[PDB]
């Protein structure tokens, strides 16, 4: 009712769904092109390689939300 | 009245050993271990009697067994 619970059950809220937060915009990512990770892409960049990305879950997302 | 219906999470459910058939119908007893806010605990039963709270992180939680 004051801004001293506020913060403090909004601190333990924010904590303890960090986790789930961080896979949510791992999965936002993942659906919107972003599937690879930084060392991979450096390591396939460092042979002069482009790095292609098959989105193959985004077109079953789409299905299923066509449906 | 109204007849609520709820699912019991079946780890936190204790049936008592001597049963030894399926639908538990020769049970004596049977054990919930609840986790259980603090205002939830007060509107459960007053302040009269002493409960044991916890400090798990700032809202006094407590775990009580519904038997």
Known sequence: ???????????????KALIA???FLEAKKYYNGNQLP???LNIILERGQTPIIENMFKVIVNKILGY | VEI?????????????YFSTDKNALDARRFHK???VSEQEA??????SVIVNYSNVNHER???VIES
């Open chain 2, 61 to 63: 939680i407590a775990s």
């Open chain 1, 21 to 23: 937060n961080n896979e």
């Open chain 1, 38 to 40: 930084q060392d991979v």
């Open chain 2, 4 to 16: 609520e219906i709820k699912a019991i999470k079946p780890e936190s459910f204790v049936i008592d």
């Open chain 2, 42 to 47: 007060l509107l459960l039963f007053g302040d």
């Open chain 2, 33 to 35: 271990m609840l986790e």
């Open chain 1, 1 to 15: 009712m004051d801004f001293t619970t506020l913060q403090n059950d909004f601190t333990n809220d924010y904590q």
